[model samples]
Target: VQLQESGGGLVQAGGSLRLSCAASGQTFSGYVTGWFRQAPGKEREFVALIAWSGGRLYYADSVQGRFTISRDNAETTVYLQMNSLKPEDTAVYYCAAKRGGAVTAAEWYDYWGQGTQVTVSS
Candidate 1:
Protein backbone atom coordinates (compact mmCIF):
# COMPACT_ATOMS: atom_id res chain seq x y z
CA VAL A 1 0.00 0.00 0.00
CA GLN A 2 1.04 3.58 -0.61
CA LEU A 3 0.04 6.88 0.95
CA GLN A 4 0.51 10.43 -0.26
CA GLU A 5 -0.25 13.48 1.92
CA SER A 6 -1.34 16.78 0.45
CA GLY A 7 -3.22 19.92 1.43
CA GLY A 8 -2.89 23.49 2.67
CA GLY A 9 0.59 24.82 3.42
CA LEU A 10 -0.42 27.93 5.33
CA VAL A 11 -3.24 28.93 7.65
CA GLN A 12 -3.85 31.83 9.97
CA ALA A 13 -4.48 31.59 13.67
CA GLY A 14 -8.09 30.54 14.43
CA GLY A 15 -8.42 29.29 10.85
CA SER A 16 -9.24 25.80 9.75
CA LEU A 17 -7.69 23.49 7.15
CA ARG A 18 -8.16 20.14 5.60
CA LEU A 19 -5.43 17.64 4.72
CA SER A 20 -5.78 14.53 2.64
CA CYS A 21 -4.05 11.21 2.21
CA ALA A 22 -4.68 9.28 -0.98
CA ALA A 23 -4.25 5.56 -0.80
CA SER A 24 -3.32 3.23 -3.63
CA GLY A 25 -2.22 -0.33 -4.39
CA GLN A 26 -4.33 -1.74 -1.61
CA THR A 27 -7.89 -2.14 -0.37
CA PHE A 28 -8.21 0.45 2.31
CA SER A 29 -11.43 -0.68 3.93
CA GLY A 30 -9.59 -3.23 6.00
CA TYR A 31 -6.86 -0.88 7.09
CA VAL A 32 -6.46 1.94 9.60
CA THR A 33 -4.55 5.18 9.26
CA GLY A 34 -2.40 7.05 11.75
CA TRP A 35 -1.81 10.82 11.68
CA PHE A 36 1.35 12.20 13.20
CA ARG A 37 2.55 15.76 13.64
CA GLN A 38 6.17 16.91 13.73
CA ALA A 39 6.99 20.45 14.68
CA PRO A 40 10.17 21.89 13.26
CA GLY A 41 13.06 20.40 15.27
CA LYS A 42 10.73 18.33 17.41
CA GLU A 43 9.80 14.69 17.70
CA ARG A 44 6.68 13.36 15.99
CA GLU A 45 3.49 13.14 18.04
CA PHE A 46 0.77 10.64 17.40
CA VAL A 47 -2.36 12.70 16.86
CA ALA A 48 -5.04 10.36 15.68
CA LEU A 49 -6.05 7.26 13.76
CA ILE A 50 -9.12 6.22 11.80
CA ALA A 51 -10.43 2.84 10.86
CA TRP A 52 -11.17 2.93 7.16
CA SER A 53 -13.89 0.34 7.31
CA GLY A 54 -16.12 2.38 9.59
CA GLY A 55 -14.84 5.92 9.71
CA ARG A 56 -14.23 5.66 13.44
CA LEU A 57 -11.48 7.88 14.78
CA TYR A 58 -9.35 7.75 17.88
CA TYR A 59 -7.61 10.94 18.92
CA ALA A 60 -4.89 11.75 21.37
CA ASP A 61 -6.05 13.80 24.35
CA SER A 62 -3.91 16.66 23.13
CA VAL A 63 -5.97 17.01 19.96
CA GLN A 64 -9.31 15.49 20.78
CA GLY A 65 -11.13 18.79 20.87
CA ARG A 66 -9.61 20.41 17.78
CA PHE A 67 -8.95 17.61 15.30
CA THR A 68 -11.29 15.47 13.30
CA ILE A 69 -10.23 12.47 11.18
CA SER A 70 -12.35 10.70 8.62
CA ARG A 71 -12.22 8.80 5.34
CA ASP A 72 -14.04 7.64 2.25
CA ASN A 73 -13.23 4.08 1.53
CA ALA A 74 -14.76 4.30 -1.93
CA GLU A 75 -12.40 7.12 -2.73
CA THR A 76 -9.51 5.42 -0.96
CA THR A 77 -8.70 8.61 0.85
CA VAL A 78 -8.47 9.82 4.44
CA TYR A 79 -8.96 13.37 5.63
CA LEU A 80 -7.82 15.46 8.56
CA GLN A 81 -9.67 18.56 9.63
CA MET A 82 -8.29 20.92 12.23
CA ASN A 83 -10.04 24.00 13.50
CA SER A 84 -9.04 26.84 15.82
CA LEU A 85 -5.48 26.70 14.59
CA LYS A 86 -2.65 28.40 16.42
CA PRO A 87 1.03 29.04 15.80
CA GLU A 88 1.69 26.11 18.06
CA ASP A 89 -0.18 23.95 15.54
CA THR A 90 2.33 24.61 12.78
CA ALA A 91 4.01 21.37 11.84
CA VAL A 92 4.55 18.70 9.22
CA TYR A 93 1.71 16.20 9.21
CA TYR A 94 2.18 12.63 8.06
CA CYS A 95 -0.37 9.97 7.18
CA ALA A 96 0.37 6.27 7.36
CA ALA A 97 -1.75 3.17 6.97
CA LYS A 98 -1.61 -0.40 8.17
CA ARG A 99 -3.73 -3.54 7.88
CA GLY A 100 -3.78 -4.77 11.44
CA GLY A 101 -7.26 -5.43 12.72
CA ALA A 102 -8.33 -4.16 16.15
CA VAL A 103 -5.62 -1.55 16.24
CA THR A 104 -4.03 -0.88 19.60
CA ALA A 105 -1.37 1.41 20.93
CA ALA A 106 1.04 -1.37 20.06
CA GLU A 107 0.40 -1.44 16.32
CA TRP A 108 2.56 0.74 14.06
CA TYR A 109 1.92 2.07 10.61
CA ASP A 110 3.37 0.06 7.73
CA TYR A 111 3.05 2.59 4.88
CA TRP A 112 3.77 6.29 5.16
CA GLY A 113 3.49 9.44 3.12
CA GLN A 114 6.25 11.97 2.58
CA GLY A 115 4.35 14.45 4.78
CA THR A 116 2.89 17.94 4.30
CA GLN A 117 4.29 20.92 6.11
CA VAL A 118 1.63 23.33 7.36
CA THR A 119 2.43 26.74 8.75
CA VAL A 120 0.08 28.79 10.90
CA SER A 121 0.88 32.47 11.31
CA SER A 122 -0.68 35.88 11.63
Candidate 2:
Protein backbone atom coordinates (compact mmCIF):
# COMPACT_ATOMS: atom_id res chain seq x y z
CA VAL A 1 0.00 0.00 0.00
CA GLN A 2 1.09 3.58 -0.67
CA LEU A 3 1.39 5.92 2.38
CA GLN A 4 1.95 9.65 2.31
CA GLU A 5 1.93 12.43 4.98
CA SER A 6 1.45 16.11 4.22
CA GLY A 7 1.62 19.11 6.57
CA GLY A 8 3.25 22.49 6.98
CA GLY A 9 5.73 23.68 9.61
CA LEU A 10 4.17 24.63 12.91
CA VAL A 11 3.32 28.33 13.20
CA GLN A 12 4.79 28.52 16.72
CA ALA A 13 7.94 26.87 17.96
CA GLY A 14 5.72 24.11 19.27
CA GLY A 15 2.76 23.31 17.09
CA SER A 16 1.19 20.23 15.62
CA LEU A 17 2.36 17.60 13.16
CA ARG A 18 -0.45 16.32 10.97
CA LEU A 19 0.10 13.17 8.92
CA SER A 20 -1.76 10.37 7.20
CA CYS A 21 -1.14 6.83 5.90
CA ALA A 22 -2.97 5.53 2.84
CA ALA A 23 -3.25 1.84 2.11
CA SER A 24 -4.37 -0.27 -0.84
CA GLY A 25 -3.82 -3.97 -0.01
CA GLN A 26 -6.99 -4.29 2.05
CA THR A 27 -9.89 -2.23 3.28
CA PHE A 28 -8.80 -0.45 6.48
CA SER A 29 -12.17 -0.81 8.18
CA GLY A 30 -12.48 -3.10 11.22
CA TYR A 31 -8.67 -2.97 11.45
CA VAL A 32 -6.41 -1.34 14.01
CA THR A 33 -3.90 1.38 13.17
CA GLY A 34 -0.56 1.74 14.95
CA TRP A 35 1.58 4.83 15.39
CA PHE A 36 5.18 5.04 16.59
CA ARG A 37 7.75 7.74 17.23
CA GLN A 38 11.34 7.12 16.11
CA ALA A 39 13.50 9.76 17.66
CA PRO A 40 16.94 10.29 16.15
CA GLY A 41 19.42 7.57 17.11
CA LYS A 42 16.92 5.99 19.50
CA GLU A 43 14.56 3.05 19.38
CA ARG A 44 10.93 3.61 18.49
CA GLU A 45 8.09 3.68 21.00
CA PHE A 46 4.34 3.53 20.98
CA VAL A 47 2.22 6.57 20.23
CA ALA A 48 -1.18 4.98 19.82
CA LEU A 49 -3.04 1.97 18.44
CA ILE A 50 -6.59 2.71 17.42
CA ALA A 51 -9.15 0.12 16.34
CA TRP A 52 -11.43 2.15 14.14
CA SER A 53 -14.44 -0.11 13.84
CA GLY A 54 -14.72 -0.86 17.55
CA GLY A 55 -13.28 2.45 18.80
CA ARG A 56 -10.85 0.50 20.98
CA LEU A 57 -7.62 2.45 21.00
CA TYR A 58 -4.51 2.16 23.22
CA TYR A 59 -1.81 4.61 24.10
CA ALA A 60 1.51 4.21 25.87
CA ASP A 61 1.68 5.52 29.42
CA SER A 62 5.08 7.04 28.74
CA VAL A 63 3.56 9.42 26.22
CA GLN A 64 2.49 12.58 28.00
CA GLY A 65 1.31 15.39 25.75
CA ARG A 66 -1.51 16.52 23.51
CA PHE A 67 -1.92 14.00 20.71
CA THR A 68 -4.74 12.61 18.62
CA ILE A 69 -5.33 9.82 16.06
CA SER A 70 -7.95 9.66 13.36
CA ARG A 71 -8.76 7.95 10.07
CA ASP A 72 -10.81 8.69 6.94
CA ASN A 73 -11.95 5.86 4.72
CA ALA A 74 -13.34 8.42 2.31
CA GLU A 75 -9.75 9.51 1.79
CA THR A 76 -8.44 6.00 2.27
CA THR A 77 -5.95 7.16 4.85
CA VAL A 78 -5.27 6.78 8.56
CA TYR A 79 -3.96 9.79 10.45
CA LEU A 80 -1.57 10.63 13.28
CA GLN A 81 -1.86 14.17 14.53
CA MET A 82 0.32 15.39 17.42
CA ASN A 83 0.05 18.80 18.97
CA SER A 84 2.54 20.72 21.15
CA LEU A 85 5.52 19.67 19.12
CA LYS A 86 9.03 19.84 20.58
CA PRO A 87 12.51 19.14 19.30
CA GLU A 88 12.17 15.88 21.19
CA ASP A 89 9.19 15.14 18.95
CA THR A 90 11.39 15.46 15.88
CA ALA A 91 11.47 11.97 14.52
CA VAL A 92 10.39 9.63 11.74
CA TYR A 93 6.73 8.95 12.39
CA TYR A 94 5.24 5.65 11.28
CA CYS A 95 1.76 4.14 10.93
CA ALA A 96 1.11 0.44 10.84
CA ALA A 97 -1.45 -2.25 11.42
CA LYS A 98 -2.12 -3.66 14.89
CA ARG A 99 -2.50 -7.41 14.82
CA GLY A 100 -5.99 -8.12 16.05
CA GLY A 101 -5.41 -11.76 16.92
CA ALA A 102 -2.92 -13.03 19.51
CA VAL A 103 0.66 -12.18 18.71
CA THR A 104 3.48 -13.20 21.02
CA ALA A 105 0.53 -14.06 23.25
CA ALA A 106 -0.72 -10.48 23.00
CA GLU A 107 -1.92 -7.99 20.44
CA TRP A 108 0.91 -6.40 18.44
CA TYR A 109 1.85 -4.96 15.07
CA ASP A 110 1.43 -7.06 11.96
CA TYR A 111 1.67 -4.54 9.11
CA TRP A 112 3.75 -1.42 8.67
CA GLY A 113 3.54 1.62 6.41
CA GLN A 114 6.50 3.09 4.52
CA GLY A 115 6.75 6.00 7.05
CA THR A 116 6.77 9.82 7.10
CA GLN A 117 9.45 11.79 8.93
CA VAL A 118 8.76 15.36 10.04
CA THR A 119 11.54 17.06 11.95
CA VAL A 120 10.43 20.09 13.95
CA SER A 121 13.25 22.58 14.26
CA SER A 122 13.34 26.21 15.25
Candidate 3:
Protein backbone atom coordinates (compact mmCIF):
# COMPACT_ATOMS: atom_id res chain seq x y z
CA VAL A 1 0.00 0.00 0.00
CA GLN A 2 1.12 3.54 -0.63
CA LEU A 3 1.06 5.94 2.30
CA GLN A 4 -0.11 9.53 2.08
CA GLU A 5 -0.54 12.10 4.84
CA SER A 6 -3.50 14.45 5.15
CA GLY A 7 -5.48 16.71 7.49
CA GLY A 8 -2.65 19.18 7.95
CA GLY A 9 -3.00 22.94 8.22
CA LEU A 10 -2.43 25.86 10.55
CA VAL A 11 -3.37 25.21 14.15
CA GLN A 12 -3.58 27.46 17.16
CA ALA A 13 -1.38 26.90 20.17
CA GLY A 14 -3.28 25.78 23.29
CA GLY A 15 -5.48 23.93 20.80
CA SER A 16 -5.53 20.49 19.23
CA LEU A 17 -5.04 18.94 15.83
CA ARG A 18 -5.54 15.66 13.99
CA LEU A 19 -3.83 14.08 11.03
CA SER A 20 -4.19 10.92 8.97
CA CYS A 21 -2.26 8.43 6.87
CA ALA A 22 -4.06 6.76 4.00
CA ALA A 23 -2.66 3.42 2.80
CA SER A 24 -5.27 1.73 0.71
CA GLY A 25 -3.46 -0.24 -1.96
CA GLN A 26 -3.31 -3.40 0.13
CA THR A 27 -4.54 -5.03 3.26
CA PHE A 28 -3.30 -2.61 5.90
CA SER A 29 -3.27 -5.33 8.54
CA GLY A 30 -0.23 -6.82 6.85
CA TYR A 31 2.00 -3.85 7.47
CA VAL A 32 3.80 -2.31 10.39
CA THR A 33 3.29 1.43 10.57
CA GLY A 34 4.54 4.40 12.54
CA TRP A 35 4.30 8.15 12.77
CA PHE A 36 7.06 10.76 12.95
CA ARG A 37 7.50 14.49 12.82
CA GLN A 38 10.20 17.11 12.33
CA ALA A 39 10.28 20.68 13.46
CA PRO A 40 11.37 23.34 11.01
CA GLY A 41 15.09 22.88 10.33
CA LYS A 42 15.29 20.16 13.00
CA GLU A 43 15.72 16.44 13.24
CA ARG A 44 12.79 14.04 13.01
CA GLU A 45 11.22 12.46 16.07
CA PHE A 46 9.09 9.39 16.62
CA VAL A 47 5.51 9.91 17.68
CA ALA A 48 3.90 6.47 17.70
CA LEU A 49 4.27 2.97 16.26
CA ILE A 50 1.95 0.11 15.46
CA ALA A 51 2.57 -3.47 14.43
CA TRP A 52 -0.67 -4.79 13.08
CA SER A 53 0.57 -8.36 12.89
CA GLY A 54 0.91 -8.60 16.63
CA GLY A 55 -1.67 -5.97 17.42
CA ARG A 56 0.94 -3.93 19.24
CA LEU A 57 0.92 -0.18 19.76
CA TYR A 58 3.51 2.13 21.24
CA TYR A 59 3.70 5.81 22.00
CA ALA A 60 6.71 7.88 23.02
CA ASP A 61 6.79 9.62 26.35
CA SER A 62 8.01 12.58 24.41
CA VAL A 63 4.45 12.71 23.19
CA GLN A 64 2.88 11.50 26.45
CA GLY A 65 -0.84 12.15 26.77
CA ARG A 66 -0.47 15.07 24.44
CA PHE A 67 -0.63 12.83 21.40
CA THR A 68 -1.90 9.45 20.24
CA ILE A 69 -1.98 7.02 17.32
CA SER A 70 -4.87 4.90 16.16
CA ARG A 71 -6.13 2.93 13.23
CA ASP A 72 -9.26 2.12 11.23
CA ASN A 73 -8.73 -1.36 9.87
CA ALA A 74 -11.92 -1.24 7.88
CA GLU A 75 -10.83 1.95 6.15
CA THR A 76 -7.21 0.89 5.86
CA THR A 77 -5.88 4.11 7.33
CA VAL A 78 -4.18 5.35 10.48
CA TYR A 79 -4.50 8.48 12.52
CA LEU A 80 -2.33 10.84 14.54
CA GLN A 81 -3.99 13.24 16.91
CA MET A 82 -2.51 15.78 19.28
CA ASN A 83 -3.77 17.91 22.13
CA SER A 84 -2.48 20.58 24.49
CA LEU A 85 -0.64 21.83 21.47
CA LYS A 86 2.39 24.07 21.87
CA PRO A 87 4.29 26.28 19.48
CA GLU A 88 7.09 23.73 19.51
CA ASP A 89 4.63 21.25 18.05
CA THR A 90 4.79 22.92 14.70
CA ALA A 91 6.23 20.39 12.30
CA VAL A 92 5.67 18.23 9.24
CA TYR A 93 4.16 14.84 10.08
CA TYR A 94 5.04 11.64 8.29
CA CYS A 95 3.98 8.00 8.12
CA ALA A 96 6.30 5.11 7.39
CA ALA A 97 5.92 1.41 6.73
CA LYS A 98 7.42 -2.02 7.25
CA ARG A 99 6.04 -5.45 6.49
CA GLY A 100 5.82 -8.95 8.03
CA GLY A 101 8.23 -8.66 10.96
CA ALA A 102 8.23 -9.01 14.70
CA VAL A 103 8.27 -5.72 16.55
CA THR A 104 10.98 -6.39 19.11
CA ALA A 105 11.69 -2.81 20.00
CA ALA A 106 12.94 -2.37 16.49
CA GLU A 107 11.29 -0.62 13.55
CA TRP A 108 12.32 -0.27 9.94
CA TYR A 109 10.84 1.77 7.15
CA ASP A 110 10.47 0.50 3.61
CA TYR A 111 8.16 3.29 2.49
CA TRP A 112 7.30 6.81 3.58
CA GLY A 113 4.59 9.31 2.80
CA GLN A 114 5.57 12.71 1.48
CA GLY A 115 4.38 14.14 4.77
CA THR A 116 1.98 16.97 5.58
CA GLN A 117 2.87 20.14 7.40
CA VAL A 118 1.09 21.41 10.47
CA THR A 119 1.86 24.88 11.76
CA VAL A 120 1.16 25.86 15.34
CA SER A 121 0.45 29.55 15.85
CA SER A 122 -0.26 31.82 18.77
Candidate 4:
Protein backbone atom coordinates (compact mmCIF):
# COMPACT_ATOMS: atom_id res chain seq x y z
CA VAL A 1 0.00 0.00 0.00
CA GLN A 2 1.04 3.59 -0.60
CA LEU A 3 -0.01 6.79 1.15
CA GLN A 4 0.87 10.39 0.53
CA GLU A 5 0.57 13.42 2.84
CA SER A 6 0.84 17.13 2.01
CA GLY A 7 0.54 20.07 4.39
CA GLY A 8 2.53 22.68 6.17
CA GLY A 9 5.15 21.32 8.54
CA LEU A 10 4.71 24.41 10.65
CA VAL A 11 1.46 26.10 11.64
CA GLN A 12 1.50 29.36 13.55
CA ALA A 13 -1.17 30.90 15.69
CA GLY A 14 -4.10 32.16 13.63
CA GLY A 15 -2.76 30.54 10.48
CA SER A 16 -4.46 27.88 8.41
CA LEU A 17 -3.23 24.36 7.76
CA ARG A 18 -4.17 21.57 5.44
CA LEU A 19 -3.31 17.88 5.10
CA SER A 20 -4.07 15.42 2.36
CA CYS A 21 -3.56 11.68 2.22
CA ALA A 22 -3.61 9.72 -1.00
CA ALA A 23 -4.42 6.10 -0.50
CA SER A 24 -3.55 3.10 -2.62
CA GLY A 25 -4.08 -0.66 -2.16
CA GLN A 26 -7.67 0.03 -1.20
CA THR A 27 -10.73 2.00 -2.20
CA PHE A 28 -11.38 4.99 0.02
CA SER A 29 -15.04 5.16 -0.93
CA GLY A 30 -17.80 4.20 1.47
CA TYR A 31 -15.31 4.17 4.30
CA VAL A 32 -14.32 6.84 6.80
CA THR A 33 -11.17 8.87 7.21
CA GLY A 34 -10.19 9.70 10.76
CA TRP A 35 -8.22 12.63 12.18
CA PHE A 36 -6.59 12.84 15.58
CA ARG A 37 -4.30 15.02 17.66
CA GLN A 38 -1.45 14.42 20.12
CA ALA A 39 1.09 16.64 21.75
CA PRO A 40 4.63 16.23 23.05
CA GLY A 41 3.55 14.81 26.40
CA LYS A 42 -0.09 13.95 26.17
CA GLU A 43 -2.44 11.27 25.01
CA ARG A 44 -4.25 11.57 21.73
CA GLU A 45 -7.70 12.95 21.10
CA PHE A 46 -10.14 12.03 18.38
CA VAL A 47 -10.73 14.85 15.98
CA ALA A 48 -13.12 14.00 13.20
CA LEU A 49 -14.15 11.47 10.62
CA ILE A 50 -15.10 12.21 7.07
CA ALA A 51 -17.79 10.11 5.49
CA TRP A 52 -16.90 10.80 1.92
CA SER A 53 -19.36 8.43 0.33
CA GLY A 54 -22.12 9.75 2.53
CA GLY A 55 -21.04 13.40 2.69
CA ARG A 56 -21.15 13.73 6.44
CA LEU A 57 -18.71 14.49 9.24
CA TYR A 58 -18.33 14.06 12.98
CA TYR A 59 -16.18 16.59 14.78
CA ALA A 60 -14.68 16.76 18.25
CA ASP A 61 -15.32 19.49 20.79
CA SER A 62 -11.87 21.07 20.98
CA VAL A 63 -11.75 22.06 17.35
CA GLN A 64 -13.15 24.91 15.30
CA GLY A 65 -12.79 27.17 12.29
CA ARG A 66 -12.95 26.28 8.59
CA PHE A 67 -12.09 22.65 9.24
CA THR A 68 -13.19 20.37 6.44
CA ILE A 69 -12.37 17.01 4.91
CA SER A 70 -12.81 15.48 1.46
CA ARG A 71 -11.99 12.33 -0.44
CA ASP A 72 -12.05 11.08 -4.02
CA ASN A 73 -12.64 7.45 -4.91
CA ALA A 74 -11.08 7.73 -8.35
CA GLU A 75 -7.88 9.30 -7.07
CA THR A 76 -7.96 7.60 -3.68
CA THR A 77 -7.12 10.78 -1.87
CA VAL A 78 -8.35 12.29 1.40
CA TYR A 79 -7.92 15.92 2.34
CA LEU A 80 -8.13 17.80 5.64
CA GLN A 81 -8.18 21.57 5.92
CA MET A 82 -8.15 23.75 9.02
CA ASN A 83 -8.00 27.45 9.68
CA SER A 84 -7.39 30.00 12.48
CA LEU A 85 -4.80 28.05 14.37
CA LYS A 86 -3.57 28.63 17.90
CA PRO A 87 -0.39 27.80 19.80
CA GLU A 88 -2.58 25.34 21.59
CA ASP A 89 -2.98 23.67 18.21
CA THR A 90 0.59 22.49 18.24
CA ALA A 91 0.43 18.74 18.00
CA VAL A 92 1.04 15.67 15.91
CA TYR A 93 -1.79 15.03 13.51
CA TYR A 94 -2.68 11.74 11.96
CA CYS A 95 -4.79 10.30 9.17
CA ALA A 96 -6.39 6.94 9.66
CA ALA A 97 -9.27 4.72 8.56
CA LYS A 98 -11.66 2.02 9.67
CA ARG A 99 -12.57 0.61 6.28
CA GLY A 100 -16.08 -0.36 5.16
CA GLY A 101 -18.08 1.59 7.74
CA ALA A 102 -18.16 4.69 9.90
CA VAL A 103 -15.53 4.53 12.61
CA THR A 104 -16.32 4.43 16.25
CA ALA A 105 -13.90 4.01 19.15
CA ALA A 106 -14.88 0.35 18.74
CA GLU A 107 -12.26 -0.79 16.28
CA TRP A 108 -10.17 2.36 16.46
CA TYR A 109 -7.66 3.05 13.73
CA ASP A 110 -6.90 -0.20 12.00
CA TYR A 111 -4.67 1.63 9.55
CA TRP A 112 -2.61 4.77 10.01
CA GLY A 113 -0.26 6.97 8.08
CA GLN A 114 3.11 8.06 9.38
CA GLY A 115 1.86 10.95 11.49
CA THR A 116 2.55 14.59 10.66
CA GLN A 117 3.67 17.04 13.31
CA VAL A 118 2.71 20.71 13.24
CA THR A 119 3.83 23.16 15.85
CA VAL A 120 2.05 26.43 16.39
CA SER A 121 4.48 29.12 17.38
CA SER A 122 4.96 32.85 17.22
In the order shown, the candidates' Cα RMSDs to the true structure are 2.1, 3.6, 2.5, 2.2
The reply for model 2, stretches above 4 Å from the true place, is 1-12, 52-54, 62-65, 73-75, 101-107
True lDDT of residue 106, candidate 4: 30
Better-scoring candidate (lDDT), 2 or 4: 4
Note the Cα lDDT for every prediction shown. 0.82, 0.64, 0.79, 0.73
Higher-scoring candidate on lDDT, 3 or 4: 3
> Distance from true position, residue 42, model 4, in Å?
1.0
- The candidate scoring highest on TM-score is 1
1-122: candidate 2 lDDT, tens digit per residue: 44444553434447776787776766677567677767788887777766745366566664444677677746367777677776777777777765464122113676776667767776
In model 2, what is the error at residue 41, expressed in angstroms? 1.4
Residue pairs in clash, model 1: none
Q: On residues 1-122, what C-alpha lDDT tens digit does candidate 4 reach at each position?
A: 35556684785678888888877787777567778877889887777778756477777776744577776657387777878777877888877877666664634667777778878888
Q: Which residue pairs of candidate 2 clash?
A: none
Q: Report the lDDT tens digits of candidate 3 across residue range 1-122.
A: 78999988887888888888988677568788888888988887877877854378878777778887788847478888888888887889888887766342324677789999989898
Query: Which sections of candidate 1 miss by over 4 Å?
Result: 73-75, 101-107
Alpha carbon lDDT of residue 39, candidate 4? 82
List the candidates' TM-scores in order. Answer: 0.88, 0.75, 0.86, 0.84
- 45-121 in candidate 1: lDDT tens per residue? 78888874765778888778898888773858888999888898899999888877535342367788899988999
Residue 2's lDDT in candidate 2: 40
What are the clash counts of all predictions, listed in order?
A: 0, 0, 0, 0
